[model samples]
Target chain A: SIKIECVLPENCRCGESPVWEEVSNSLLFVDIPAKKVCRWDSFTKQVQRVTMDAPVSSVALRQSGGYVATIGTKFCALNWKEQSAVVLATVDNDKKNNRFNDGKVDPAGRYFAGTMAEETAPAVLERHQGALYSLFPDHHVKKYFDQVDISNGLDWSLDHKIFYYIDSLSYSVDAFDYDLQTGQISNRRSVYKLEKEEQIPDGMCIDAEGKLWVACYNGGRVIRLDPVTGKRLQTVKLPVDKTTSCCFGGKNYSEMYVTCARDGMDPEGLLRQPEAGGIFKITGLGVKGIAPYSYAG
Target chain B: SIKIECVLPENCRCGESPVWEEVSNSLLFVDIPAKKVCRWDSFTKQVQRVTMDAPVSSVALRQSGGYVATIGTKFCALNWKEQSAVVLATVDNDKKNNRFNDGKVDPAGRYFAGTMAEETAPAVLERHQGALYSLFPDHHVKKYFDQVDISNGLDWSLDHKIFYYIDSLSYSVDAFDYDLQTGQISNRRSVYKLEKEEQIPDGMCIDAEGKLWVACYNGGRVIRLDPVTGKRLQTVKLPVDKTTSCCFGGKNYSEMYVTCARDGMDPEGLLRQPEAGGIFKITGLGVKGIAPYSYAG
Candidate 1:
């Protein structure tokens, strides 16, 4: 696969989650500290913020219409044209302590978003108490799981019978036996373990071939793994620190969109990769991902 | 209320999220970004961290014993021996992009923790993608909700009928018609609305009188509000721009333990409030707070 670098619009800070929307032919992602949800059109090279009010962590295409998004403490059904929002669900109103990090819809169009501990308080992250939630179309919520450091890299196998997840602390991807019919997961275990020398997995995707593509957060690369055996197949290196979530999108789902970051970078690091917090493209991968599901509502 | 100011142990950064433990008779809080949960014994005037990790958002007391905490993205049942945490739950396997932040236990001894967008990349506060999870003694996970920007202040009413929550971006404290029996909440409405002049609401507490006390994130004051009517009742001034959360803890549950920040402060701002990140205590309030619950694992 030929790796291609894509520069950000401007001052894109902490660019992490990246998803390509085939419908819009644009890559959507969130700039965490800049507090912006940005869309970059591959065709036009035009970048615009969908909304600045709510920082979008991870975005997915709504099967019905608009986009399904997670903002701060609330989930929304967002209309890209009007830039209007509809509330789907909220964990709570308190904004200082908690916020949404990474989220993707399940195979069933149910939104499965995860939470990361607040950045303001250091003690909170050390305790490692956060969770992942599933939001149904009717606004019904199910407590899917809990006890995470930073919930990232949520993906399911092509068969939809297995799930892969990550928390940055342990450098491992967890897998579970997922029941597609019931949306119930059991037999929790580690599927892939990244050695400390390797990249700590962030956002992840399952290709049409059932191979898992895990983004390396701190290590600045994305690694391919066997979802069942936790075997590392290949790695795609980037010129950034944190390579967040990845998705196969862009016309026919052949393009791999990767998000990177300039967070915690000093002036020297920034000078090295001025386009650190931008989206990159990897073409000719041939592997395609199923369209990420959006909230049914 | 008479406010008392004191510096943290030493070299502390962003001291916030204080919970009073009767057993220890200490004000427990976090120096966020500094990555430590510390307890300061008022009687002894000794400050010590319970544990160290990435960065911590908040901490609280368990009903039976020990402490319930959120570190990064995982919620841990912590036993602080001198200052080391025994991992209770490694909740989220995907750690690269998520972190745990603010957390408190519910009335049922379930530790309810909130997450936030990662500070680095592909994550943002407005993502509203964070989640609230409840961890049981049996280590069973119950994911409550998702798409929360920053789940800061989480407090159940004394009667457990009303829930007070706030998403920082909205700068408002929202109340939900909560069901204690089913532990389900609906009828979301804004109970506490802050005017533009009012400071943004951060973490909050509901007093014995059902009054909500909120820590101002940027506005340098703690504002008390009527949780039902959402009317601003009283305001408590602080000498900081980034006050995070306020909890009612201490002897007789009269002291207000406040967590604050020194981050994002310009040199001028720091000069104005040098102790922005230090923990503070305010006493002489007539009303008391309900004891914090523990997610005993």
Candidate 2:
């Protein structure tokens, strides 16, 4: 892949979701620990941070004035100008233990978010510590599937029929039978599985060509995969090893940004790698992604 | 404090250990999850991110060449241009749980680093699963202490006789009887206990005044405490909640740079406070910290 440009932000701890905002002609994403959603304008080289108190996981554009976002433990509508948010739902009852992870709104205008245990939880206890839930416009809460160890990477097809869900630890993305009419997912089946060599998978999104961009957790590459065939298609090398997630943004949705981390490597591991937890921009390929959708209730 | 400028690049998550680089006339720091040590030139408004495999907890100036940093789970010396790091130590044997948190170099030229579990453990497991380690120049590793949940705020007295350690969960700063010759700590005692009204204490650094600048985790205010009396002397309010850590940077060291977290708050908690995760700075503080010593072997 050809490098269009390199945009590195110095102090991002956990750079997660990436979404294209067509209106702004920029890429929007959040640093969970930083707890701020940012939009990067490739043309102007200007990035704006929409700061919030709790960690924000993902953002989607709304047809209305504000945006739909996963902040702390629930999905809500956010306004950058006023720096305020209106909560749509509260998913975690164990307020201390759970918060939202990677999430996105579906084509059906439903905002889907996943919750996980607090950072202090034991790595082993991470599994089965939290569950996934959905927020309906009417404030009805529907608990989706459970038994996830950091539920992440939710995406829909261009036609908005098929749905994808990933339980990060299992290293598999499970497909669900989607009902556009009722906004229900059934008939669970495996869509993608990690090969012996790949690292854990984190967040994901689909491109216009219906290709999936999967960010490899503990892996330094953002890979393109055929969701149906589960075939590895293309890979983009990132400077950091823990490339958590990627999204295509920019006016045409051509700019690809990735996130990484440097949490557990030794000096040797860090010295060999060097740029573990930085955000990056990679562009050159022609394909792109749609602007993020607003969670319309 | 007046808003100076947005010095960080877009999308820095879990940013820690912000230090001012005199050579570059900019702020340099590490994004733990992004894994890259970054340099942000406020004058040019340019932000750059480097890459590494592990989350970088802190960065400091070296006597010569580049920076001494805590990366992944160990300490290293970094040559920014070479994008290379020299290995010094590897403290965590169980890669699954442990990672380095807050760290700093004392005036005596030894790197004082602390370790803590990245996640909480099950009740059957060790609740406080991490420890603190000191790495000497000869590549000698010594365990100073353990059983702390997320060790943070490393500081040494002006005379380098007394040392301060704060575990975020404890929300209290503890004093240790430090033996510079032996690099050992004993007689652990709480010098300052944060009232429930205060934010959890985070990464801390000492100033010329010998007072401590502590970023109050989950508390928007960074408190200045008199080391001798262990009394709260002053407070600086940040725009965000969950303030993670703070340090003294800039040429004269009057610039106080603070790292905050969007890590712990819930949805209701989020809506209450927005700027939860972003780097913040205030000016005209105290004398700068000495350049961090390298543990590179």
Candidate 3:
């Protein structure tokens, strides 16, 4: 009985991560290829957007009340109202084709995002060239895990004992031993695997029950997984196929905000899924998300 | 996260109760106006149905085999495969306009159901025209509660000490003290209320967590409530407005099967909801329903 409705039908190319803004009750999201950061106000049902100089992958809230954004390979302090960004720190300039994709602030107040090989003409076909990186409050950056391909969705368990993550092409959700004090991960193991060849697990978030809600990259649905037993608990169908990522928002974090992509589709394909790039709001899901952490710096 | 999908698009006038048949691994449901009972098989993904002489309100399984059902004002022994019914006993023929609406088997192996005035011309605005009734193994029927508007959903607490009920037009859920040994109820008290004027609490079932899941007629959703606090826990919105009832099915009762109706809508309203009378499957609720009890008889 869950319901999904499109809140913003912007038709942006490669729409990604969505963050719930509590103060003004708005949704902050990014349009990857469009190089734009958008804030949609729930009050007016309108969007206040800012176009940046480079494609921004994701954004996090700062403790002092602003935005710390990942623009390409560089971490930047974003002035959302001023439509501007100032470079803070750059990670791994070695791979020119690599770029940060999905990310969030950990409970310990560290910004963690991973990179992927940039897509090209036929396909990227690149593997193990990117890595997951962490940025501390002092603007110091460090690379953690290596040999990653399309490093994507991530979150920590309720008890913070495990780190759950996905590497799109691997077709599996892997869990790693987590250290809250040092922010380190080890003892990786598969918790859940994609049963269908078409299901490429993309963006993800953990619900109040410690279950995982994952966005299927090429599949037209968001799936709920019981991390304990690795069972496919539920699948929420979407009209759009390229569902990029999702986060809980609304008053009690009871609403799921989903982002999609219009990229990699021809005119005919786009016609079939007219709402492909729109941001969707899913309601009536009997689960809640925890409050997001603000960057310590 | 939770998900929903239309499994049957029969467009029945009023698809009331959904009973999961574990032996056949199918769903057994009733079509009130059509006087039909249908069995949908998971294997063939097709329906095997039988049309009867009189409208059937709900069906409960029998421990010895076959079904015990409420047809009009008569309790019948149903031969599901033969498409026929034999009247076991009739309770209160005093009001011909009153008929059984929703019913289920109590854990102690007794069948319980309630009556509502038959829909007529300008609409059956008849309140307090119904009564809750109980039928024992010896084919004897006894009236329990008196002066009911629309006696609907019924279930008991995990301990069997609390009996939860609904009188639809009353717009609230009432609990009663139960004597499991005697199969009697007393001391009625309010447990939950429908806040919205549009919501009429209908059929219900209790989950593994001992919480109540209720169908909201005219409200377009099924809500989960914490029975202890009467707090609204979650809601699942449907594509159609008249969600009549729900029951858990699938391997471990992890999937929720919901019933809907198209009886009270106009042509324009029906057009807006093409799947108005379809049977739906809800998954990923992160909760399971306890195994339903069969008639002791």
Best by lDDT: 3
For model 3, the interface Cα RMSD in angstroms equals: 25.6
Tell me which residue pairs clash in candidate 3.
none
Predictions' DockQ, in order:
0.02, 0.01, 0.01
Off by over 4 Å in 2: A120-124, A262-276, B1-297
**Estimated TM-score per prediction?**
0.50, 0.49, 0.50
Tell me the tens digit of each residue's lDDT in model 2 across A45-119.
788888888888878776667678888887788887888899877877754667789878777667787887766
What is candidate 3's lDDT per residue for A56-143, written digit by digit as tens? 8898888876798888888888877777788888876877677888888888888988888776422212345568988888888878
Residues B1-297 of candidate 3: C-alpha lDDT, one tens digit per residue: 778899889797889879999889999889987988778896688988778777889998989889888888888988876768988889768997888889999889999999888777624655568989989887788788776878899898999998999888667788999989988899877788775333788999999899999999988899999988878998889999999998989999999988998988988999999999899999999999977899997
Q: For model 1, how does the per-residue alpha-carbon lDDT over A151-265 read when each residue is reduced to its tens digit?
A: 8888888778887778765578888898877778888898888866565678888888888888887777888898766689887777777677788887778888887777767
Query: On lDDT, who's better, 1 or 2?
Result: 2
Query: Which of the two, 2 or 3, has more TM-score?
Result: 3
Write model 1 residue lDDT over B81-150, tens digit each, in one string.
Answer: 6555556665545545667777777676666676767763322433555776667767777777776667
| Fnat per model, in the order shown | 0.00, 0.00, 0.00
The predicted structure with the larger lDDT, 2 or 3, is 3
